[PDB]
Amino acid sequence: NNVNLADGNYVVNRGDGWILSRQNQNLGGNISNNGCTAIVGDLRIRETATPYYYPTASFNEEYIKNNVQNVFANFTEASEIPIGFEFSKTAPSNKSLYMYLQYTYIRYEIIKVLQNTVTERAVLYVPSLGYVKSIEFNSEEQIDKNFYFTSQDKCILNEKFIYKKIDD
Amino acid sequence: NNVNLADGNYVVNRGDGWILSRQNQNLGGNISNNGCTAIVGDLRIRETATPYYYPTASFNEEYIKNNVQNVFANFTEASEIPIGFEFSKTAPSNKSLYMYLQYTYIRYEIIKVLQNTVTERAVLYVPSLGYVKSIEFNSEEQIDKNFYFTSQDKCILNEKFIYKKIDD
Amino acid sequence: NNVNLADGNYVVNRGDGWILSRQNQNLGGNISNNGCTAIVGDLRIRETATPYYYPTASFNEEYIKNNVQNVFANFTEASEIPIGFEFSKTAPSNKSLYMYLQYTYIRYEIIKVLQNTVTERAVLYVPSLGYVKSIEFNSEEQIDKNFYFTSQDKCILNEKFIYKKIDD
Amino acid sequence: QTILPYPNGLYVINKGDGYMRTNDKDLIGTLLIESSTSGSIIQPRLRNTTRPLFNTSNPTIFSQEYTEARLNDAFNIQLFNTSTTLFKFVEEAPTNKNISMKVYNTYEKYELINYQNGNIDDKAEYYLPSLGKCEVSDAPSPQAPVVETPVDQDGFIQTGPNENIIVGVINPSENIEEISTPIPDDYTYNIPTSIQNNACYVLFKVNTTGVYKITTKNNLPPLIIYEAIGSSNRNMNSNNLSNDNIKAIKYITGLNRSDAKSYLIVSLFKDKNYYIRIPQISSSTTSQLIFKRELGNISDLADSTVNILDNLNTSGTHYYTRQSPDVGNYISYQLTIPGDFNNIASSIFSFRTRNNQGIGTLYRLTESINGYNLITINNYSDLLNNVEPISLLNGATYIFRVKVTELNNYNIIFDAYRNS
Amino acid sequence: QTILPYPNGLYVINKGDGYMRTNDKDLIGTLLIESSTSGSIIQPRLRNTTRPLFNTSNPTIFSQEYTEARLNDAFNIQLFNTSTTLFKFVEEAPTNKNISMKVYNTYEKYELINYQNGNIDDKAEYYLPSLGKCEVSDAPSPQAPVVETPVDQDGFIQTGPNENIIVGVINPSENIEEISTPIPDDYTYNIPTSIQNNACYVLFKVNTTGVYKITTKNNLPPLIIYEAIGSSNRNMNSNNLSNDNIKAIKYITGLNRSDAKSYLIVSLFKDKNYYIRIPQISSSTTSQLIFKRELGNISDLADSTVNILDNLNTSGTHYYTRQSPDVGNYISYQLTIPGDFNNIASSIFSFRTRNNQGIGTLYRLTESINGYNLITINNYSDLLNNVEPISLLNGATYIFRVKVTELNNYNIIFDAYRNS
Amino acid sequence: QTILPYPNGLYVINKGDGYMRTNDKDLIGTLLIESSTSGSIIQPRLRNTTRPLFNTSNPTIFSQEYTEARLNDAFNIQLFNTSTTLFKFVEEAPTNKNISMKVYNTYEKYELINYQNGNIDDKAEYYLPSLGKCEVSDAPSPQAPVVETPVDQDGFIQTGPNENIIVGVINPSENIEEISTPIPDDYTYNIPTSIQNNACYVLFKVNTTGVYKITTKNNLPPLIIYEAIGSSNRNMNSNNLSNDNIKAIKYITGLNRSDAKSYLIVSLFKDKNYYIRIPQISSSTTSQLIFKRELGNISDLADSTVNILDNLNTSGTHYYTRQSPDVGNYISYQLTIPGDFNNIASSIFSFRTRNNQGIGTLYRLTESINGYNLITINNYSDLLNNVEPISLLNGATYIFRVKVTELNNYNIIFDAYRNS
Numbered sequence A, B, C: 001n002n003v004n005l006a007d008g009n010y011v012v013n014r015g016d017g018w019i020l021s022r023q024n025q026n027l028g029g030n031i032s033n034n035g036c037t038a039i040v041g042d043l044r045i046r047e048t049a050t051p052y053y054y055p056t057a058s059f060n061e062e063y064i065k066n067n068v069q070n071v072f073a074n075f076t077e078a079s080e081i082p083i084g085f086e087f088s089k090t091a092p093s094n095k096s097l098y099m100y101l102q103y104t105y106i107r108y109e110i111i112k113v114l115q116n117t118v119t120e121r122a123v124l125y126v127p128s129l130g131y132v133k134s135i136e137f138n139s140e141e142q143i144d145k146n147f148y149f150t151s152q153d154k155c156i157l158n159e160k161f162i163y164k165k166i167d168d
Numbered sequence D, E, F: 001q002t003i004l005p006y007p008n009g010l011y012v013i014n015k016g017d018g019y020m021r022t023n024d025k026d027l028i029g030t031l032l033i034e035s036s037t038s039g040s041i042i043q044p045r046l047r048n049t050t051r052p053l054f055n056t057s058n059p060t061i062f063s064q065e066y067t068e069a070r071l072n073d074a075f076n077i078q079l080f081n082t083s084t085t086l087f088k089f090v091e092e093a094p095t096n097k098n099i100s101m102k103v104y105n106t107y108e109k110y111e112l113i114n115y116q117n118g119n120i121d122d123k124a125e126y127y128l129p130s131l132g133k134c135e136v137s138d139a140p141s142p143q144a145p146v147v148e149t150p151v152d153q154d155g156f157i158q159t160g161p162n163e164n165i166i167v168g169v170i171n172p173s174e175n176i177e178e179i180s181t182p183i184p185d186d187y188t189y190n191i192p193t194s195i196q197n198n199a200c201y202v203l204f205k206v207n208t209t210g211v212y213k214i215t216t217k218n219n220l221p222p223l224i225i226y227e228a229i230g231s232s233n234r235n236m237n238s239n240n241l242s243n244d245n246i247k248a249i250k251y252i253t254g255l256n257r258s259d260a261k262s263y264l265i266v267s268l269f270k271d272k273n274y275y276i277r278i279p280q281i282s283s284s285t286t287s288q289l290i291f292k293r294e295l296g297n298i299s300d301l302a303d304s305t306v307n308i309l310d311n312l313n314t315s316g317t318h319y320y321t322r323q324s325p326d327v328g329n330y331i332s333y334q335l336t337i338p339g340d341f342n343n344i345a346s347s348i349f350s351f352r353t354r355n356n357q358g359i360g361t362l363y364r365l366t367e368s369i370n371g372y373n374l375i376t377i378n379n380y381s382d383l384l385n386n387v388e389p390i391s392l393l394n395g396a397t398y399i400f401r402v403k404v405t406e407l408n409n410y411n412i413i414f415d416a417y418r419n420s
C-alpha cells in the first residue's frame, strides 16, 4: 500500500489485462474434440461493453472519467467503433477441449496520497479485449475449482503504475 | 417397408444429411486451378431456407410441424438466427477443380402403421446445412452424369429411424 | 505512340493492374513484427470506389462510359455489389514489417487515329482491386523514396491493347 | 447440331457451369500477389441481388418469367436473382515467384427448347449466376511487349467441366388427368372429351411391379410414357397415388408420328409415378387407354414401342420411318405375315434398317398357350443393309426387336423385305 | 442427493457448461467433410438474440426475472438473451477418410435454490446460451444398417467438463445494515427494532487484521458470518467501509438452529468486507452484536462456531445436534463442567460424534491470565464411537474442537458422555 | 531543423506512417495468447467513421478544411474521416511460451507548411487514420515488479519506417494562366495586368523536347519553374494542352530573391506539363515571358538559374547571395567582365562560394557562331575558399556553374574576386 510520490491527487493507469471476480463464464464456453479447431470471439460494441466505476466520496464517476480520458485513452470515443478479437485452439486427437471466454479490462485508479500511503482510491475498469482459458477433459475427470472461478480481481499481464498528477 | 413396432401413428427422425432430387446445382459451382484454395459457403436465413412438406390425407402440414417441433428441434425458432457453413479445397497443381454446393436436410416422417408395414407416410425436409461435391477436370474430359444429378432423394450420412408415438 | 490500325475512333482496354500517381499511401499502412501475420483488405463499394475520367474535346465522359460499358465490363452495374479483397504477410522474426495498400484500376482509352499515330486520347480508370507493397524496416533504416511514391501512372501487370472500332 | 433422341415437347438442358461473357465482361479483378504473400478475393454477399442473363428466340412465348417457371419445373430452382451463397479464393505466392490471381463471375447455362419433329422450334438460354472462377498463374512481366489484339466476338465461353443434363418438363398448356387408384393388372381408362381440343397427360401408378402392355383402342394414336423424376420415397397412402406436382419427367419410350399404330411394352415399378401423354384426337367417338399386365418373356421387349406393320401383301420394299431410340435402347415391329396358316413358309423375309445401325432379334409370337410367349428365331449382329433371308410361316405373328447401336439420324427406317 | 454443508438461504450453483436437450433438439447441423477438404460451421451473431431456457418449482416466487436477478447477484451476468460473442468450428478431413462434423448449441446450467434446514424448498434452473459443442468422427457408412430406436426421455444431457460452483447470495427480502466505520478491537452494535419483523445482515469490516469473537448478548441467537466475494482491491477510504453492493457471499461459519447458544471465533482480514446475518428475534428488549479482538492461541479455533453446552449435571448421554461443517472445517463445543473448583476431576468424560467422522482436540480454556489461553489436553484421531475416558477438573472450562473428515449427514451430533 | 532547398510557397510533406499518441492513447488492447493458441485482433469496419487528428499554428488561414484541400491537391486524398479498409493481426503462440499481442491505431502524419524566405511562416499537421500497428513479444510475468513511472509528455511517437516525401502544391490564391497551344521553339507571352495584384502561374507545354532559355524582358523578375506531377500518359490532343487540374508540382529551378536578374536553362519534355510562377510586378508597363529553344552545349547548364552578375568594375570582393540548390543540383552565374574586347586578360579573377560547398565549372560563352557555344576553361573540385586565379579576356562573357555538394545554409553565397 506504500507509494513513493508527493502529496496530492493522481490519476493512474494500472495496465491492460485485468479480469473481474465472479464473471469468468458469463460469456459461455466452447467444447470440441478429435483434431477440431475451435474458435471463439466477440465484436465488442457499446451495448455489451460496459465500464465499471467504483467511485469514492471525493472522486465521483464524472471526475474519474474526465481525468482518465484527458491523460489516457478516450474510451467513450473508442466505444463507438466496433472491434473484433478472437482466439482459436485445435482440440487434441481422441480427447475433448473446453474453452471459455471473458472480457479483459484496463484498470484505472484515482488516488489521494499523504507521502507514505494511499489515503483514498476510486477504481475504473474499461473494457479492453478478452481472454480464453482452456482445459482438456473427459466426462469422468474432476477439475480444479479455481479454473472456473476468480474470486478476486487480478491482472493476467504484469501490473503497471503509470501516474499523472491532477491539478499538479 | 416392414417396421417392427406397435399399431398407431408415429413421428420419426430419419436423420440429417438428406439431399433432394434434381436440385444438385441450384446454388451454383466454383472453378479453381493451380494450387488455389477455393471456398464456398452460405449464411442460411429464413428467406433462402425453405422447408419442404409432402403431406397426406390424415397428416397435414400443421400436423407434421407441431409433432416434429414438439419431439425434435424447433426449426421455426431456429430459422430466425443466421448460421454459416463453408467448405474449402485446394486445387491441384496444373489441374482444374470444380466444386458445387447443395443444401442438406433433416428428413422427418409421420407414419401410420398396422403391425406389419407403414400404411401412410407424410414427409418433411427441414433445411440443415450443406454439402459440396468436387471433381478435377480439363476441357476435353467427359464426366459421369450422376456426378451432376441426383434423381432420387438420398442421405449422404447413415439413415436413422428415431421414433415417438403420437398420442401414445 | 505509333499504332498499326486503320483510320477512325477506337475504344481500347489497356488492362487491369494500373496504379495512379501520388496516391500510394492514401489508404494507409500497417506495421507488424516478430512472426505476426498482418492482414489488410477492403470491401469496395460505390462510395469509396470512384472512377477517374480524363476526357477530351471530342470524347466526353458519357461517350467514354457508354462505349466502354458496351464492349467491356459494365462497371456501373458491378459497383452496386460489394466485393472484398485482402492481402496477408507474416512479419519476420526479430524484424518489423511495413505494408501499405492502394487501389488498382482497369485503364481504358478512347483514341482517334490517322494511320500513323494516336491523334486524340481520352482516359478512364475504373476501380478494380488493390495492391500491397511491403518492406522490412527498423527505426534507423533510411529507405528509397520511390517505395512510397509513384510519380507517373503505371501498370503492375503487363499492359494490354485490346481494341474495338466505334461505329466501325 | 447433335441428334436429340426424344419425342416432341419441352426440355430444359443444363449445359454446364463456368460460363462467362467474352472480353473480360465478367472480370471481378486481378490481384498481383508478391512472393511470400497471400491474396484473396471475396464475394461476401453483403447484397443478395444477383444479375442473371437471358436470351430468347421468341420473347412472347418464351419470356423470362416463362423460362424461369420451366427451370423450376425441371430443377426446382427457387431463387433466380437473389443469393446468400458466398465464394472466396485464397492463394499464397511461393518464396521465389510472384503470382497473378484473376477472378470472374460465372453462370450456369440452362437451355429451354420447344422440340418438334426433330427441330428446335423455340429456344431460350437462361444464365444463372454461379460461384465464380479463379485463374492463377505466374505473374506476367510488366515489361512484356504489348500485342495489339482485336476485341473478340460478343458472347459466352465455357470454362467449367463438360455437362449436358437434359430434363423433360410437362407442357403446362396440356392438362393432367390423374388415376388416383393404383392400377390393377388389367385397367381401361376412358379418355375424356377434352382430348379433342389438345393433348393431355395421364398420371398413374401400378399396384404391382411388372411388365405392362399399354395401348389405345385399335392401337391409334401412338402413346408416349415418361417417369416422374424423384417421386420415389416421399409421401404415400395405401390405395391412393401421391401427387407432389412433380413436373420433371424422364422419357421412357413412345413417339409422335400419327400413323404409327402401336402399343408399348414397358417395365413399370410400384414405387414410381408415370405419365402417359395422349395426343389430341379430333374424333367424336370416345377413345380408351388400355393397360394389361404381361407375364412371360415378352419382357424381352421391356421399354419399347411395338410398331404394327401394315399392307405387306405386296412383295419387296416395305419401309417404316419412326423416331429412333437412343443408342442401347429398343424399337420393335410386329408382323402378321400374309396368307393362311398351315406350315408353308411365306415369301421369304429379309430385315434391315436404313439410317441407324442396330443389333436385331427375330421372335415368333405365340398367341394362345396361357399368356403370350416369344420364341427366338434368329439374331442379327448388324442391321444396316443386312440381307440374311429367313422363312416365316404364313399367318404366324413375328416381332422384330432393334437395339440401336449408332445414332446418325433422328429417324430410324425399318425395311421388311418380302423376297420371292 | 449430496449433503450441502451450508446454512439456510439462497444459493446460485453453476452446474457446468455443455448442457443440451435430448433428441437433437439443439443440433445446428452436420457437415460431411470429404477427404482433403475443410468444413466449417459458424455462429456469426448476425442477430444478437439468444434463447435461454428456464424451469421452476414455484413460478410465483422464483420467476424468470427473479432468478435472473439472483444470477446477477452471484456471477454478475449482465445480458441474458442477447450475445455479441461468436463461435466457429473448422476441421480438415485427412487424405484417406471422410469426416462427420456435428455441431450443437449448448447452455450453462445455473441452479437457484432456497435451502432450508437441509432441504431444497424452492428450485429454479436457468440455462444460459453458451458457445457450442462440436463432435467430429469418421464419416459413417451411408450403407450402415438403420436401427429402429425409440426417442429417449425429454430433458438435458451434460457434455462439458464437471463443474459445481456454489455461490451464496444475499436474500434481497432481508435488509442490510452497514457499520460504515471499520470496527476497532472492541465493538458493540445495537440491533435495531426491524429485527423483530425479519432477519437482517450487518455489513462491516475490521480496522485491524486478527482473530475475533463474535456473539450476541447472552449468546443467543446464533450468528452466521459470510465474506463478500471480490470486495478486495477496488475502492477505498481511510475510516469508511466502501460498499460496492456486492451481494455474492461466501459462507465462513455459523448456523441456524435456534437453541444453539454460541459465539463465533473467526479470522477476519482488514482488506475484506464481511456480512453477519442476525436472525429474526421477536423479543421487545434490544439485542446487541458484540465484537471482541482475541490475541493468543484461541486462534486454534479460527473459523468455528463455539457451541456452549448446557444441563450437564446429569450423567451419561448428552447429545447436541448441529449443522455439520464441511470436510476439513471446524465445529467447537465449550464445556464448564459441573461442581466447585479445587482440583478433583469431575465424573470422567468421554467425547464422541454420531453421524459424521472427525479428528477432535480437547483444550482447557484458561480464564484470567492476561487474555485467554488454550492448553492442549489430548487429541483424538477418530471421534465416531470414541471411548477414551478423560478426567476434567470440576468448575474448569474446556473446549472441544471437531475437524470434520467424512460428511455423511447434514447434521453432526456431539455426545459429551459423563461417565461415573 | 533541416535546410529545405525549395522556393517560397506551399508544401505538403508526408512525414511517414505509424504515428501514434503517447500514454497508450491509441491502444486498441492487448491479448494474452497462451501456448498452442492463436489470437487475433480485427478492425472490420462495421462503422466507416474514422477520427483524424489535426493541429495548426494559425487556425484562421490553415483551417482543417483548408489543409484537407491541400492534402487533396498533393496526394489526391479523397476521404478524410471515412474508411472501408480493414486490418487484422493474427499470431499463434509457440508450444513452450505464452505471447503478448498489443495492437494500436496509427496515423500518417501530413505536414502543410507555408514556406517563406527559408522560414516556416504557417504550419499545420494532419494525422490521417492508418491501418494499425501490432507489437508481439513474450508474455510478461504477472509476478513482474510494478515500477512506478510518470506519464510521459503529451504528443506523438513514430513507429513506422522513416519517410519524408515533400510535394509542392499550387497556391490557390494565385491565378493560373494557360498557354493552350504547345509552344514552338521561340515564344513570347504577354503577362496580363493581374500580375500587378498578385503572383500567377502560367501552365504550358513544349511542342518539341529540348533545352530552353526562359526569361522575362530585361531578365527581371526572376522566375520559378515546376513540373506537374503525374501529367504524363493520360488525356491528349494534337495542338492543345490537356489540363487535368493537377495541382501537385515538382520544383525544377528558380528563386524568389527580387534583385536576382537571371534566366533559366531547363531541359523540358514534350509529354509533360510545366508551371512557371511569375511574381507580382507592380509596374504599369507590360512584362513578357520569353521562351527560346537552345541547341548546342548550353545544355551543360540544364536545370539551372543563370544569375547575371552586375557592377564588377570595382576590384576585390563581389558577393551574391542566392537560394542554394539542393545537393547535386546546379546554380549558374553569367559574367561579362569589364573592359573593351581585344585579347588582354582582365584583372585576374578568383571564384569561391561562402556557405555551401560545390564542384564548379568555368565556361566562356561564345556569342555568335550559329547559336551559342560553351568552351570549358577550367573545373574546380572544391569552391569553399578556393583561390586558384584565372585570367579572363576583357569584354568576353563567361558562365560559372556550381554543382552543390554540401547544404549547410538556405543561401549559397558566390564571390567573383577581381584580383589585380
Ligand SMILES: CC(=O)N[C@H]1[C@H]([C@H](O)[C@H](O)CO)O[C@](O)(C(=O)O)C[C@@H]1O
Residues within 6 Å of the ligand: D259, D260, D309, D310, D311, D317, D318, D319, D320, D321, D322
Ligand atoms: C399404311 C402403311 O403401313 N404405311 C407405311 C408406309 C409404307 O409402307 C411405305 O412408305 C412403303 O414402303 O411408310 C411410312 O409412311 C413411312 O415411310 O414411315 C409409314 C407407314 O406406316
Ligand SMILES: CC(=O)N[C@H]1[C@H]([C@H](O)[C@H](O)CO)O[C@](O)(C(=O)O)C[C@@H]1O
Residues within 6 Å of the ligand: E259, E260, E309, E310, E311, E317, E318, E319, E320, E321, E322
Ligand atoms: C438445553 C440443552 O442443552 N438442550 C440440548 C438437547 C439435550 O441436551 C439432548 O437432547 C439430551 O441429550 O439436545 C438438543 O436438542 C439436540 O439434540 O441437539 C440440543 C440442545 O442444545
Ligand SMILES: CC(=O)N[C@H]1[C@H]([C@H](O)[C@H](O)CO)O[C@](O)(C(=O)O)C[C@@H]1O
Residues within 6 Å of the ligand: F259, F260, F309, F310, F311, F317, F318, F319, F320, F321, F322
Ligand atoms: C547591384 C548588384 O549586383 N548587387 C549585388 C550585391 C553586391 O554586389 C554585393 O553585396 C557587394 O559585394 O550583393 C547582393 O545584395 C547579395 O549580397 O546577394 C546581391 C546583388 O545582386
